[model samples]
Target: SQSNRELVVDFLSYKLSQKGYSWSQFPMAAVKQALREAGDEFELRYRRAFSDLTSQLHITPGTAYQSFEQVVNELFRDGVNAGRIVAFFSFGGALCVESVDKEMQVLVSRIAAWMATYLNDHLEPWIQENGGWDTFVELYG
Candidate 1:
């Protein structure tokens, strides 16, 4: 129903308001690094869960959002709060594990794009239920 350019503004706005950040000031790499860092910790924290969950290699641009939503929903079903949320980052970063082409060379940060899409879908609900990223910041930061 909407274009991603608009959704991107929405995403950037949320980060600006929610985390007090900006593109010129905060930039893309910082957030990606932050999540990947938290994700690594959470993936390690839930070693068994992440390995088993992503073993299927289900989340990707090709499989469609429904498939992505299915796995994230299960994670929500599996558990919530920071555990599943953090691992959600791990899941997104894991996407380019074996794919991505040179023409799509900007492919690196594009992972964050799809991850944002996942959040726009099923991930935000559970985040709201748990306490938003503010509490998550204190809990994990």
Candidate 2:
């Protein structure tokens, strides 16, 4: 579990390192733009992140799903908004859908759906408590 979270942290750390900025200095707008541009190449766009996680952080295919959840949870903890959360899940969902193996594809799809629903149901109230969805959009969209 800790390693999975570290993989996500490593990816974000890599992004910040490449941009020469701290997490606080990195803007959500840029993150959103990247997400939007990723489109069908979500896997390709994040190749470095995946590579870094595997080689640098020693993450494995068997633990990839845990890493996905860690990324989602930590991003929200780091102040990312709901729309970006949706994008993250959608990106993972796309990865799953694009996989050639049917069983793995279905498994990841179910995980993505569960996470998305969990966000909307369990996290929505927290999002509202923070200042509602509108404020999240305004601040992070």
Candidate 3:
């Protein structure tokens, strides 16, 4: 149904915002529209959740931590939003510095690399070393 498809795109639009991204930037709305137009049976091209963002979530960097965790955990329990996070960061960098006629790709790439390294080194191990989800829940819950 068109409504169902629209709902997904709309939810997706908002979800992108939650990760510090905007549909107002490059390719987001177009991609969503293409998917919606593709209809229900169309092959879905879902972007992975930003694991880097999720991995960085904590409970007592103060109240901000709680807010951040609430959003990421709700959207990305399975880690599929990761790609969108990276793409959005790219889109953001490209949009933010339009005055820079070049280097948008480099800027976004650098940002993404830094985030991946940060998450892999800090977040991945923290989650593993802390004994997984239950341990995290106990701290946050």
Candidate 4:
């Protein structure tokens, strides 16, 4: 985000919604395509900033959910936009690194749920307005 939290959430958001919630939700291939590219760019474009933020988001099992809540809360302290959306996946990426390292298999998919909700709550509308990640992909792709 191998444990690969970004992929898990991307799958969860689009696939899970289609299967478990609504067939039309996030069914766009472009949306999932953009989500994949976004995570890749996060590893490159935002890599520097991600280093600082992910380190702080470093996890510790039982106490880490609150850590995630706080860290993710501040990521959008200025409000949602393109770069922070990368950070959304990037944040999930780092969480997996920490979770897998500590032998917490359970937390991996759990955070997938969290990332989807975070996106639905804040990141989704912005993506809709931006219209299929074009604004994001061109700028950072």
- Model 1 TM-score (2 dp): 0.55
Tens-digit lDDT string for candidate 3 (97-133): 3312332323332332333443344344544555542
Candidate 4 lDDT over 40-82, as tens digits, reads 6566655463566667766555555556677788888998888
The C-alpha lDDT values of all candidates are 0.50, 0.42, 0.35, 0.61
TM-score on alpha carbons, each prediction: 0.55, 0.37, 0.25, 0.65
Off by over 4 Å in 3: 1-16, 19-109
Name the Cα RMSD for model 2.
12.6
Superposed on all Cα atoms, model 3 deviates from the true structure by an RMSD in Å of: 15.6
Tens-digit lDDT track of model 1 for 47-135? 56455556565444456555556665676776566767666655544444323322332333455565668666766677667665455
Between candidates 3 and 4, name the one with more favorable lDDT: 4
By summed lDDT, the worst window of 10 consecutive residues in model 4 runs over 18-27
Backbone clashes (count) for model 1: 0
Compute the lDDT for candidate 1.
0.50
> Looking at candidate 3, what is the lDDT of residue 120?
47
Candidate 1 backbone collisions, by pair: none
Shift in Å, residue 104, candidate 4: 1.3
Instruction: Report how far residue 113 has shifted in candidate 2, in Å.
Output: 3.6
What lDDT score is found at residue 122 in candidate 4?
A: 64
Backbone steric clashes in candidate 3, count: 8
Off by over 4 Å in 1: 1-37, 46-49, 58-62, 100-111
